[PDB]
Design a protein around this ligand. Sequence first.
Ligand SMILES: O=c1cc(-c2ccccc2)oc2ccc(F)cc12
Ligand SMILES: [Zn+2]
Lengths: 47, 161
Amino acid sequence: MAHSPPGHHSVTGRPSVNGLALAEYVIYRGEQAYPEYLITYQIMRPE
Amino acid sequence: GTILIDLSPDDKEFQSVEEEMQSTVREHRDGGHAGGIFNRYNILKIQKVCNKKLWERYTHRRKEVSEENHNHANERMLFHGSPFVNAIIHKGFDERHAYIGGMFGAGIYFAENSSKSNQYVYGIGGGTGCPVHKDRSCYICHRQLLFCRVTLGKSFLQFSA
Ligand SMILES: O=c1cc(-c2ccccc2)oc2ccc(F)cc12
Ligand SMILES: [Zn+2]
């Protein structure tokens, strides 16, 4: 796994073209996330 | 050591988690190629993931980050979709859950948009879709996402397309 840029603990990907996109994030240490909820679902076919 | 507790749909905690799921669906630039065509989900179940060891491992690292960033963990709740969700909930996140080819290098990626994480549930780019029908837009098969507590600390800001 790579490393955080020096002096940082994560990377934020800020959307710069798709005005409706929200942010995406990367961590480089597994201990920096806890899988708190398991959500089971189906996508729904639009009408 | 992991146990799954089911939340009742009547519980405010089920309801706030469902709302985050539903309200952060968006349209994607692939017109639904990777994750399918949908505006909303049918939530079938929401379970709380409980594991003392993985939790303590998370809070230990959280305190370290916090102490290197003026007592600010910069903690978020973010989605994660992965073929490896069963390994994750039992064994924790590790380098086997990393996206080697991701835009910001080899790490573990999370999304504010549930629909973005949905694109990775059957693999990178949606893989070959659901196991049963080979359909990236399957409306039948059950999918799973994780809603995760994530420590960002000082985050390097990448402006990007
Ligand atoms: O939830 C995600 C899972 C994954 C993922 C990638 C490779 C293997 C397993 C999961 O990639 C993402 C990329 C961007 C993003 F915003 C979210 C994700
Ligand atoms: Zn299917």
